[PDB]
């Protein structure tokens, strides 16, 4: 339950990061499902990528 | 990649609250064979909870 909640919360944040493109979001989310123990690292990577793609 | 795609689409649905989204993800994990039914249920709930 803990991991499913973690990936649900992290996944929701990832898909709502406004500067990511759809393939980037989908790739992070697929990685989340494949290895939920990486949720914090994937969220952090996604946020950094999002910030580098700011207008 | 059917289960992964359903997970992705569930996470994208804007009008689910956190408890509802978490519950769908848990159900997907518990029985991935039901991905299409769960996604359809989630979509229905999403549309019913559109801001009015």
Residue numbers in the entry:
A (entry chain B): 3 to 57
B (entry chain A): 7 to 58
From the study:
We adopted the Z domain of staphylococcal protein A and its affibody binder dimer complex as a model system. We next generated libraries at the interface of a weakly associating dimer (Z+ ZSPA-1) with micromolar affinity to determine if we could affinity-mature the interface by coevolution. To clarify these inter-residue co-variations discovered from the sequence data, we determined crystal structures of 10 coevolved pairs that spanned a range of cross-reactivities and orthogonalities (5 from LL1 and 5 from LL2). From the structures, we could verify clear compensatory changes between the residues showing the most significant covariations (13A-9B / 17A-31B) in both LL1 and LL2 library mutants.
The three orthogonal mutants, LL2.c17 (VFLV/IVVY), LL2.c7 (LVLF/FIVK) and LL2.c22 (IVFF/FILV), were selected to compare differences in their affinity and structures. Each Z-A mutant binds to its binding partner with nanomolar affinity (3.98 to 44.2 nM) but has minimal cross-reactivity with other monomers. The backbone structures of the three mutants are relatively similar (Cα r.m.s.d. of Z-A after aligning Z-B ranges from 0.447 Å to 0.641 Å). The dimer interactions of LL2.c17 have sharply diverged from the other two LL2 mutants, with the Phe13A-centered hydrophobic patch surrounded by multiple rewired hydrogen bonds, an additional hydrogen bond between Asn11A and Phe32BTyr, and α-helix 2 of Z-A was slightly shifted to generate new interactions with helix 1 of Z-B, which explains the significantly improved affinity between these two proteins compared to the original pair. Binding of VFLV/IVVY and LVLF/FIIV are highly enthalpically favored and entropically disfavored, but by the end of the trajectory we see a more moderate enthalpy of binding coupled with a moderately disfavored entropy in IVFF/FILV. For example, A-LILFK has more Z-B binding partners (B=77) than A-LIFFK (B=15) from the LL1 library, and A-LVLF (B=53) and A-VFLV (B=42) are also more cross-reactive than A-IVFF (B=3) from LL2 library sequence data.
